[PDB]
Symmetry: C2
Subunit: 201 residues, 2 copies
């Protein structure tokens, strides 16, 4: 029930934006009364904040586990990029699209800002391990987020989460993120990250 | 140039608030004119928005169109296009590239904009396909170019004013990165060659 409301909200917010969307629309989309929505969420801001968090929280939690990979920065950066893109592709709606809404900057979404800042920092310092004090350390994060401009947004999931497979687009973008730094690709990178994903459970 | 002041103030409001929240009242006050004198230059905020989108997209499609037809290999041509695109995105007071991302832009009113974006995207893609063939990496160079919209300032100060004899570091970086993802080697003379090409578009 909660999951349904969040999905319907993603659909409305990605197509109409935040300002234009009412809670009335969200209730009708899900086929429930406005009262039963109010029970699960007080306002459309709370819903929006929950969506934004859902797209960065899981990857920051994952980046805890990166040091336990007994591996170099290239491998660690590849795995993070790939698993981030994996999550962005695992959803019914293109919820990553939401960060581009101008509303997101406001102080209400401070919890989201902090998580985004944490993630951005993890990407950057890993890249700095590879190229040092170079402006290219900025690129891997932006290449990762470019998938939001690539995927579908019609309710069908681009790539459902598999225990034993990474989607081609995640492999591409992760390969591309090391390529811009001039880093060589670890041969075992796909298994190694699938392994890491598996022992986050 | 009163019309131009109105368009700048509108860029500022639209990039920070979005389209829906922005009123014509705000635009008049930002510029310090009466609502009536605004109505004279523009009937609605849609007309203003459409004018902004045109102003930013037309010059870059013209740039891509012209560069795609030059006596060099695809690597050089793609590098120059990426670099000169980023150059333009960085030459403006406001981050007008940010406007593309607004969900309003998808609607049928902005069909003229959609066609220009599609044209530009196609130029980037076919140039990349000259390098890597039928590969999904042909999509990347355009997206790497547009990533500068998430990098630059948006406070009224111009990040990199247009120079006849210099490309901004960020344009060189992203252009280098766009060839790097395709595994293409960088032409040594690429910075001068593009500056030259920019110069003989005048
Ligand atoms: Ca979809
Ligand atoms: Ca600025």
């Amino acid at each position: 029930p909660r999951e349904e409301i969040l999905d319907a909200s993603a659909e409305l917010f990605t197509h109409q934006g935040f300002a234009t969307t009412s809670t009335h629309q969200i209730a009708d989309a899900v086929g429930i009364r406005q009262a039963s929505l109010y029970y699960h969420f007080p306002s459309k801001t709370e819903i929006f904040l929950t969506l934004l968090k859902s797209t960065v929280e899981p990857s920051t939690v994952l980046a805890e586990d990166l040091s336990i990979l007994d591996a170099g920065p290239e491998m660690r950066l590849w795995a993070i990029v790939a698993s981030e893109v994996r999550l962005l592709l695992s959803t019914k709606w293109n919820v990553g699209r939401l960060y581009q809404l101008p509303i997101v900057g406001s102080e209400e979404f401070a919890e989201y800002h902090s998580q985004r800042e944490a993630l951005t920092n993890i990407f950057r310092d890993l890249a700095t391990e590879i190229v040092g004090d170079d402006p290219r350390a900025e690129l891997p994060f932006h290449i990762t987020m470019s998938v939001i401009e690539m995927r579908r947004n019609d309710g069908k999931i681009p790539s459902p989460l598999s225990a034993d497979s990474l989607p081609e687009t995640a492999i591409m973008l992760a390969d591309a993120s090391l390529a811009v730094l001039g880093a060589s690709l670890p041969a075992d990178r796909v298994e190694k990250t699938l392994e890491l994903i598996k022992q986050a459970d």
